[PDB]
Amino acid sequence: GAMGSMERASLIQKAKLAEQAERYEDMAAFMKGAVEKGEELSCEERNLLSVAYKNVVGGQRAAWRVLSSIEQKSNEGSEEKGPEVREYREKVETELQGVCDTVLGLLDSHLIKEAGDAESRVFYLKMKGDYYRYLAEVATGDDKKRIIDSARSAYQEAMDISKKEMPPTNPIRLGLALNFSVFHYEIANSPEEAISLAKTTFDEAMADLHTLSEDSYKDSTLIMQLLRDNLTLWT
């Protein structure tokens, strides 16, 4: 890889610089280089990895949605404009799929296998579910049902671990549950499952806030608010 000649510490340092400069494509490249050094990531390093690709793929998804909406309208009294909209949507889609494939490959080589602590293992399985979910969002062929099940299977293993090993207010446990509920609602055609999961997740975290130190769980509160937002939109 192009990052093979750079020191691991320098990759991590430059990923944090790229984060400050909102250069997320660079940030993702540096963290991919860091993973490929073969050592496990620390808690802070896992966050750099996930934030980088979340933002890269986030922009691709938003652009794919714009184009796919234009494409849908073109297939409704709509004038034939030729192949250009489909071509450009496919271009963006193929690039999106390539980023998802890259992330999934990294998790498979060798983040998931080497993760023993529950936090890291749930973290990486959540990521695996997310990037299979993004592949599902654009899937339309024979593989859609298989891609959906790959996301479910990853999310479910993460869920089983998080309930056995983590407290209900753990931010990774909460964020896994948020995204699995989003999976149920938007991908798996299971809005009732999505709603039940978001509600029990929110309720069980509320009941456990009393154990927590002030100012130590700002991320958990943010996620609980996202659960509450989704429930308000869904009910």
């Binding site: 964020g175 989003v182 609602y185 996202l226 989704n230």
Partner: peptide, 5 residues
């Protein structure tokens, strides 16, 4: 807007 994290 459905939110994820």
């Amino acid at each position: 807007m459905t939110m994820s994290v």
